[PDB]
Structure formats: structure tokens, C-alpha cells
Amino acid sequence: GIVEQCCTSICSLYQLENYCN
Amino acid sequence: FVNQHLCGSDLAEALYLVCGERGFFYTKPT
């Protein structure tokens, strides 16, 4: 997931854009 | 927006600022 992978790790807008329409 | 730590609120607030009204889904992890 992101709640754990994005919190335990850092993420750039790119990853973000992969979780929205 | 750079690449900082995404956690709960920030997670939504971060997507809230990239999609805002675009509607961003952040389903829960396994």
C-alpha cells in the first residue's frame, strides 16, 4: 500500500499521480 | 511539491493538493 510504503518511505508526485483520477 | 514523507493526513493533504477536486483514492494497504 501507500499508507505504509509512502509513510515508511518517501514518495514523489509521480507515485502520487498513480493514486488519483 | 517535492518528494517528502507521505503519512495519513499529509498523505491525503498531499494528494489533496495534487488532485484537489480531481478525486484521489488512497485505499488501505494489506
Swiss-Prot record, chain B:
Changing residue 24 to S: In HPRI; Los-Angeles. This is Insulin B chain. It comes from Homo sapiens (Human). The lineage of its organism: Eukaryota, Metazoa, Chordata, Craniata, Vertebrata. The chain holds residues 25 to 54 of 110 of the full protein.
